[PDB]
Ligand binder design. Structure first.
Ligand code: NA
Ligand code: NA
Lengths: 173, 173
């Protein structure tokens, strides 16, 4: 039931937050934590990276294997209503803080003046430096990632992860 | 635990949907079901009504008692994460269909091109003619209303009620 060390090892300091290695070549993070004005990520020049961004979701596909130690894992666009996920929060000190969250609706929501395609959930807290941490859940014997931490209410108990673009009938559109 | 007949009696056919008597003078409904081009509601000329509208939430305060048989009850701006509500759906045939829903985040969400301030929830379905039906929950021995039905996902299991305007620290802003 608990996230294994290898899964934690995918959570990586990045910009003003974190991101997550989905596979040896694919890294996801929250758009607002991506460093501005740089010419490279992880030592790779931007022209060698396929950079996809939609709202608060960012995905990099590097041309070379950056984490060849990892298997690929499944990235999905959010998860069903009511799914219990874990937000794999690393702190700068090194502390690991997995937070349980029961997920709600996928929607495009106005957050601080911007429209954000994401999924809200209820914590069962986060701090601003936690953005980019992955929302994961276990499916059978494997873990699935379905979002990256993007926002929280000032109370704390509501959180939002950014999710990949895509329409579908289970989401509010 | 079940909604009493008097509570159901507050649910009232209105426009292309329904609305709800909060008190003898106050009626709430969903903005998009309000009839267009009319000069009166419930026989009262518009100038005798205080009509408040914010997004998909509409409130009328009539100058005279329209339902003097009713007590006032509490209207709140949505409810806490995880609250189980009941959507008091009447159908045109007369059927009553209370639907249980576990509520999620209060947010401003894009729905069919419009921004809607509301609260999403998971059904524990609705049809388009159900808009305006109240979302209620029981608090002690009394019932509280906290939204009016506004939208549902094409799957059905996610619903949205419009809620009153107002900012606060438990909502996504
Ligand atoms: Na939080
Ligand atoms: Na429904």
């Amino acid at each position: 039931g608990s996230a294994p060390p290898t899964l934690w090892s995918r959570v990586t300091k990045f910009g003003s937050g974190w991101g997550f290695w989905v596979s040896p070549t694919v890294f996801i993070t929250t758009t607002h934590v991506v460093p501005t004005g740089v010419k490279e990520f992880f030592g790779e020049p931007l022209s060698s990276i396929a950079i996809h961004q939609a709202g608060e979701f960012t995905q990099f596909r590097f041309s070379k294997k950056m984490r060849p130690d990892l298997t690929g894992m499944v990235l999905e666009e959010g998860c069903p209503e009511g799914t219990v996920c874990s937000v794999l929060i690393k702190r700068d000190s090194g502390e690991l803080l997995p937070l349980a969250v029961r997920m709600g609706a996928i929607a495009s929501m106005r957050i601080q003046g911007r429209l954000v395609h994401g999924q809200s959930g209820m914590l069962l807290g986060t701090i601003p430096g936690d953005c980019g941490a992955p929302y994961v859940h276990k499916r059978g014997n494997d873990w699935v990632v379905c979002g990256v931490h993007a926002a929280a209410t000032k109370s704390g108990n509501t959180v939002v992860c950014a999710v990949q673009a895509g329409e579908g009938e289970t989401a509010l559109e």
